[PDB]
C-alpha cells in the first residue's frame, strides 16, 4: 500500500456532540438490559506453586484443623 506517498482522506478523531450523546445513551440501556437479564435469572485457586512457603502454610492449615477438631 502506497499510503506514505498518497495518503487517503483522514479518519477524524474529533467527536461530534450528536454521536457523543447517543453513545452515552446506548451505554445506558445496555446496563439496563444486563441488569434485567440478571434479574430474570434462570472456587479458590489456592496458594501458588511458586510461593516459596506453601509447605509451611499447608502445615499451618493442618495444625489449625487439628486444634479445631480437638476443640469441637
Amino acid at each position: 500500500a502506497g499510503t506514505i506517498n498518497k495518503p487517503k482522506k483522514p479518519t477524524s478523531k474529533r467527536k461530534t456532540t450528536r454521536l457523543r450523546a447517543k453513545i452515552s445513551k446506548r451505554a445506558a440501556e445496555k446496563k439496563r438490559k444486563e441488569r434485567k437479564l440478571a434479574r430474570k435469572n434462570p472456587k479458590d485457586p489456592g496458594i501458588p506453586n511458586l510461593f516459596p512457603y506453601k509447605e509451611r502454610l499447608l502445615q499451618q492449615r493442618e495444625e489449625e484443623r487439628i486444634r479445631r477438631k480437638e476443640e469441637l
Binding site: 499510503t3 506514505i4 506517498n5 498518497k6 495518503p7 482522506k9 483522514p10
Partner: protein
C-alpha cells in the same frame, strides 16, 4: 540562569522541532529577539516515513476554487517548516502575535553575520538529552529534499567552506590559548606574593 539578551542565536542542529518551537514562541511573546540557524539539521522524532506521510497529508489540503488565493501554501524549505510550527504556537492574527513574529529570523545554514556570533543551544529540546537511545529520528533537511527543496547542495557547499574557514580560526585560537598560559606562568614569578595570596583566599 535567566537573562535578557539583545539577540539569542540558536544553533538548530540536534534539536527536536516541536520542543524548540514552543520554547522559542514563549520568548518571542515575552519580548526576546531570536535567530535560528541550521534549520536543515533539526530533528523530528520517529521514523522518516512518518514525517514524509505527514507532509504528504499536508500536501493534500488545497483549496478547490482557486489555489493562488487562500489555500494552504505548502512551504518546502527547512526554515519554513520550522516557521510553520512556531506560527501555530503564536496568536498570529492579532497585533501582538504579529509583533512577536517580527522578533524572529529563521535561516538555512549559518549566514555570514551569524557565523562569527556565538550559537546558543537549548538543553530542553536537545535530541541526545531527550530521546531514548534506541528510538528512530529523521532530519528536516532530508524531508525537505524529498518534497521539493532545491538548495540542499548549495547549503552543503557553503557549510563546507564555512567549516574550512573555522578550522583556520581555531588554529589561531589554540595559539592564543598557548600564549596566554605561557604569559600567566611568567607573570606569577613577578607578581607580589601578597597579591596572589589574597586572590587565592578570595577564590579568584
Amino acid at each position: 540562569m535567566s537573562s535578557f539578551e539583545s539577540v539569542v542565536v540558536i544553533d538548530g542542529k540536534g534539536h527536536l522541532l516541536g520542543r524548540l518551537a514552543s520554547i522559542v514562541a514563549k520568548q518571542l511573546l515575552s519580548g526576546q529577539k531570536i535567530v535560528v540557524v541550521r534549520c536543515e539539521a533539526l530533528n523530528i522524532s520517529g521514523e522518516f516515513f512518518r514525517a514524509k506521510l505527514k507532509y504528504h497529508a499536508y500536501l493534500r489540503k488545497m483549496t478547490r476554487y482557486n489555489p493562488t488565493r487562500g489555500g494552504p501554501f505548502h512551504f518546502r524549505a527547512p526554515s519554513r517548516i520550522f516557521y510553520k510550527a512556531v506560527r501555530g504556537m503564536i496568536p498570529h492574527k492579532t497585533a501582538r502575535g504579529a509583533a512577536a513574529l517580527e522578533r524572529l529570523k529563521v535561516f538555512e545554514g549559518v549566514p555570514p553575520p551569524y557565523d562569527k556570533k556565538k550559537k546558543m543551544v537549548v538543553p530542553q529540546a536537545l535530541r541526545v538529552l531527550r530521546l531514548q537511545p534506541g528510538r528512530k529520528y529523521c532530519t528536516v533537511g532530508r524531508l525537505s529534499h524529498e518534497v521539493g527543496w532545491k538548495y540542499q547542495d548549495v547549503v552543503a557547499r557553503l557549510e563546507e567552506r564555512r567549516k574550512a574557514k573555522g578550522a583556520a580560526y581555531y588554529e589561531r585560537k589554540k595559539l592564543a590559548a598557548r600564549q596566554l598560559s605561557e604569559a600567566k606562568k611568567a607573570a606569577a614569578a613577578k607578581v607580589d606574593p601578597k597579591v596572589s595570596e589574597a586572590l587565592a583566599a578570595y577564590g579568584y
